[PDB]
Design a protein around this ligand. Structure first.
Ligand SMILES: [Mg+2]
Lengths: 61, 257, 60, 342, 231, 55, 36
């Protein structure tokens, strides 16, 4: 996921999406291109933590 | 065992010798007999020792600095030098035995004639040949070798050796005959060479020399007597330098491609 | 004419050391050098723009 | 003749260095010195029809190859040599290349060398099993067994005699055993089996790697992990397998996880030093893997399927026997690849 | 036509098949180019060796099986190939070595050259214990002001005054600069040494060649000792 | 105006050379007789007075 | 034509916009407190 967004921006920059303004602003371009192929159907469920029980200890006393 | 290398077009060499330089009998003495004589002696001197697995050129470099191995050095130097002489005077290095080629017109290359002018103050190749013939007659009283050598500074110069003197390693060039008298200038050259050999830190007392031969002429009696006779060695050197195989001599000059 | 008068000045400074390849050979050699200095500027700007966004959306 | 061509480039190269050097000189000068004077000149100048040509030709030439361009995209020998000037002496790199030229042509003039042993040729030019003689085996030292004090009497039938406090192995038997062992390697190679070469004594790696390469086999030179064959799933399951055709070319088919966990057992194990590889020999027995090994006078013959009586301590003897077996495998491999073509 | 499954690597049965295969590939290059001379600037200790970390090599060199000595062996061969003379190197060597070069190019540094301000003043901050000091160093004649007060007024202890002067004494520039030091927090010792630390950091802008002498004197190091709650 | 003539001849020859192949900064702008431009300084040079003090 | 993402949706993915202060008349102070 981290390498999919960097590639999206690198391409959106190499394609050029005021030279003076090209030294101050950091707006890379359209939101769609920056987040291409990053949707709710593939990103959310893959990053969720604490999703699998891997250990359990039960004590009595 | 060191064996005599096979030469291209050997059947022609054993029948008509080397045209314009040596006859059939003259070439049998210089190569087929002398080279056998040297290789056999080298095998007897080096058999059973580590030197047996090394080519003659490597042997001379390994033994150049060892005083008591001079006998091995002399044999190795003579063998290497003799095949350097027999190689550039040979009609054709390629084996046109089945191609029956009789048209080998080899001429000095442009790189060779450019380095001659640069190193000899604009002198032409013909003039340099005259200097080579003169140097051989006045500097080599007896046996020896005539070389046109190139040094690390891209300069071609003329070196003469007495008996079996290697061109590669200046401490063993044997260019000064100390049996006769020497001038103060020659003694200075010898004294300077001794100082250079003493600056080396190696336990073998060896120095770095990058000189390489370009043309080799055998000045031994085994090469000219039978065909030219005592006193006619300058007519022999003239013929050799006029009938050199320049496909070999040109290839000995580093181009850098 | 800065676009052209700065490049003429550059050759004037080189003319000092010069004290006609300079008509077409040097003139071309200069334009190309400027193109390589204007492309490095654009490369540096891209790094700034990429370092000011969230290159690492999910973890880092 | 064509040197001028190179001279034309060098001229440009020198000019480029001059342009760059004085570009950096103007990078130090304060703008207050140049800018206001430069602008004032333009305020005192009037553009001409020609001047305007470059006013827009350079704007586009700089708006096409500097701003609206893609900053990135989605003589063969010794090509980095910097030749020295024709007047300057040779550089260190050029002297090395000048010596290499001499080494190819002149350095070998004067004599040829015959009947001299070169250690490397044992690995790269092994003889065929049919051309091996007792002299050749003896030349490699294969007959030199262990001290008579270390004798394992189970090898009695392989001994030719004792000499200088050591047992002499009978090379007549070694040759017959070597030929038999070689035929087995050739058979397995021609059948497509996995041949593993095991030797863990110092210096054996070079021979082991070349033997595997020319038989399309495998080798282990460092350490035999105890359990490699009997406990293969806990040791070798993680490593990658591949599918190959009859020409030994990767098919490229992705392998199911079921196929990538299955034990891959060698079809033949060759052991250079069996006395130090008891573990491997016992695993091969347990795994029903036929094995070949060099059996010295102190080594147990019955632990291997096809013993080769011979000195296992000398690298020459070992590399001589390994080379023969490796070439036998190579011939089997070549005969299998040949029958596929025709 | 018939297909079979075989181990991918010739070193499959070894302890670390992945590491052994990579070493073999590098060893072949070192054998094929044994003659090529090495750099004589290696005596000059060329500062180029960005090799991947042991952990990064464990991704490709067997993971847990990878041993430190195996990683050391990879570096001895990567460096030997890398140290071949640049003019006489070839593509094969560079291609094989490329996969082992660390990559940190996508990100850049966060340090901008320090320069004097519009009035020729070098401003640095220093801290000692709970004290902080912000000094303004300009070229002058040795005039010092601490919080608008004379040095002898603000600092009564001569040892505190000597500490402030020490950085200027190291570069032998005690009479070449005017210092306007402002300090707050802690006590006299913390403030005097916080000013000392800040003057040393501000003097590097005037001559960056003297940083090594300032570091060697110990005035560019921030003292970390502070009051520790007893545990 | 030879100045504008030779400048306009140099700008159009460059256009053709860059047009011949895809324009990439590293390659198209390679130094004279060079493969490309590896895109790999602020190392200010000490002044004569700065260097004298250090000496 | 791809799906248009209007400015209101795009704003959500960037830092909140702030309006310039014209006069400087402070009208309210909102202090927020939390244990995290
Ligand atoms: Mg033994």
């Amino acid at each position: 996921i981290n390498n999919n967004k960097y590639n999206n921006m690198i391409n959106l920059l190499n394609n050029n999406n005021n030279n003076y303004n090209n030294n101050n602003n950091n707006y890379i371009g359209n939101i769609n291109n920056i987040y291409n192929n990053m949707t709710i159907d593939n990103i959310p469920m893959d990053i969720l933590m604490y999703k699998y029980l891997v250990g359990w200890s039960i004590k009595f006393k | 065992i060191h064996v005599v290398p096979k030469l291209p077009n050997s059947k022609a060499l054993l029948q008509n010798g080397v045209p314009n330089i040596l006859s059939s009998s003259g070439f049998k003495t210089v190569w087929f007999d002398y080279q056998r004589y040297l290789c056999d002696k080298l095998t007897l001197a080096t058999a059973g020792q580590s030197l047996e697995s090394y080519y003659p050129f490597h042997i001379l470099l390994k033994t150049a600095g060892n005083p008591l191995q001079s006998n091995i050095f002399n044999l190795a130097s003579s063998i290497h030098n003799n095949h350097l002489f027999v190689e550039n005077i040979l009609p054709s290095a390629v084996e046109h035995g089945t191609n029956s080629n009789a048209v080998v017109k080899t001429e000095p290359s442009r790189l060779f004639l450019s380095k001659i002018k640069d190193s000899f103050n604009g002198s032409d190749w013909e003039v340099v040949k005259e200097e080579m013939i003169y140097r051989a007659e006045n500097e080599v009283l007896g046996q020896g070798w005539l070389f046109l050598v190139e040094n690390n500074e891209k300069k071609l110069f003329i070196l003469t050796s007495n008996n079996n003197g290697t061109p590669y390693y200046f401490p063993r060039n044997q260019s000064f005959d100390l049996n006769s008298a020497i001038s103060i200038d020659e003694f200075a050259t010898l004294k300077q060479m001794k100082e250079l050999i003493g600056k080396s830190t190696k336990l073998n007392g060896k120095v770095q020399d990058w000189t390489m031969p370009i043309i080799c002429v055998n000045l031994w009696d085994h090469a000219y007597l039978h065909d030219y006779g005592v006193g006619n060695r300058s007519k022999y050197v003239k013929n050799v330098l006029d009938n050199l195989n320049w496909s070999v001599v040109n290839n000995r000059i580093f181009s850098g491609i | 004419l800065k676009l052209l008068n700065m490049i003429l000045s550059m050759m004037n400074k080189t003319n000092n050391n010069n004290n006609t390849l300079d008509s077409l050979m040097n003139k071309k050699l200069l334009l190309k050098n400027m193109l390589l200095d204007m492309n490095n500027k654009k490369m540096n700007n891209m790094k700034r723009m990429l370092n000011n966004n969230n290159m690492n959306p999910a973890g880092a | 003749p064509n040197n001028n061509d190179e001279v034309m480039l060098l001229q440009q190269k020198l000019l480029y260095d001059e342009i760059r050097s004085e570009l950096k000189s103007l990078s130090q000068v304060p703008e207050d010195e140049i800018l206001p004077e430069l602008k004032k000149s333009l305020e005192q100048d009037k553009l001409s029809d020609k001047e305007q040509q470059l006013e827009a030709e350079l704007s586009d030439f700089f708006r096409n190859y500097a701003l609206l361009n893609k900053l990135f995209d989605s003589t063969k020998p010794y090509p980095n040599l910097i030749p020295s000037a024709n007047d300057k002496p040779y550089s260190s790199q050029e002297l090395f290349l000048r010596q290499l030229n001499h080494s190819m042509r002149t350095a070998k003039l004067g004599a040829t060398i015959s009947k001299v042993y070169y250690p490397h040729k044992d690995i790269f030019y092994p003889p065929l099993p049919e051309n091996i003689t007792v002299e050749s085996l003896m030349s490699a030292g294969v007959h030199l067994g262990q001290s008579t004090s270390l004798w394992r009497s189970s090898t009695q039938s392989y001994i030719y005699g004792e000499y200088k406090g050591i047992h002499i192995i009978d090379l007549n038997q070694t040759l017959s055993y070597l030929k038999r062992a070689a035929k087995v390697v050739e058979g397995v190679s021609e059948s497509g089996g996995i041949i593993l070469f095991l030797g863990t004594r110092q210096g054996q790696k070079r021979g082991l790697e070349e033997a595997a390469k020319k038989t399309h086999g495998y080798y282990v030179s460092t350490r035999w992990i105890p359990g490699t064959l009997t406990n293969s799933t806990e040791i070798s399951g993680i490593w990658e397998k591949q599918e190959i055709d009859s020409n030994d070319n990767p098919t490229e088919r992705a392998l199911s996880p079921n196929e990538t966990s299955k034990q891959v057992k060698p079809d033949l194990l060759v052991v250079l030093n069996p006395t130090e590889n008891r573990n491997a020999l016992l695993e091969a027995i347990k795994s029903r893997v036929p094995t070949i090994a060099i059996i010295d006078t102190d080594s147990e013959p019955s632990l291997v399927t096809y013993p080769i009586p011979g000195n296992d301590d000398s690298l020459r003897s070992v590399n001589f026997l390994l080379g023969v077996l490796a070439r036998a495998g190579q011939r089997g491999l070549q005969n299998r690849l040949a029958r596929n073509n025709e | 036509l018939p297909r079979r499954i075989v181990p991918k690597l010739a070193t499959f049965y070894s302890a670390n098949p992945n590491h052994e295969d990579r070493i073999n590939r590098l060893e072949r290059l070192l054998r094929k180019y044994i003659k090529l001379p090495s750099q004589n600037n290696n005596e000059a200790q060329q500062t180029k060796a960005p090799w991947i970390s042991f952990d990064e090599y464990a991704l490709i060199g067997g993971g847990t099986k990878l041993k430190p000595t195996q990683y050391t062996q990879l570096l001895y061969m990567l460096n030997k190939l890398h140290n071949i003379d640049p003019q006489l190197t070839n593509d094969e060597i560079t291609s094989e070595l490329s996969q082992y070069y660390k990559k940190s190019s996508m990100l850049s540094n966060n340090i901008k050259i320090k320069t004097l301000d519009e009035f020729g003043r070098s401003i640095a901050v220093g801290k000692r214990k709970s004290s902080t000091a912000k000094v303004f160093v300009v070229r002058g004649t040795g005039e010092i002001l601490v919080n608008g007060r004379q040095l002898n007024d603000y600092f009564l202890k001569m040892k505190d005054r000597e500490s402030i002067m020490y950085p200027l004494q190291v570069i032998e520039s005690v009479g070449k600069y005017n210092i306007f030091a402002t300090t707050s927090g802690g006590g006299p010792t913390g403030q005097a040494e916080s000013i000392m630390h800040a003057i040393a950091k501000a003097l590097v802008v005037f001559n960056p060649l003297l940083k090594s002498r300032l570091h060697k004197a110990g005035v560019l190091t921030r003292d970390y000792r502070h009051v520790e709650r007893k545990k | 105006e030879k100045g504008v003539d030779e400048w306009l001849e140099a700008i159009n020859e460059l256009r053709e050379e860059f047009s011949a192949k895809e324009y990439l900064p590293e390659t198209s702008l390679a130094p004279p007789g060079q493969s490309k431009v590896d895109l790999l300084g602020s190392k200010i040079k000490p002044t004569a007075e700065q260097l004298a003090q250090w000496e | 034509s791809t799906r248009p993402y209007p400015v209101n949706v795009e704003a959500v993915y960037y830092a909140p916009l702030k309006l310039p202060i014209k006069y400087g008349d402070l009208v309210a102070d909102i202090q927020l407190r939390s244990y995290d």
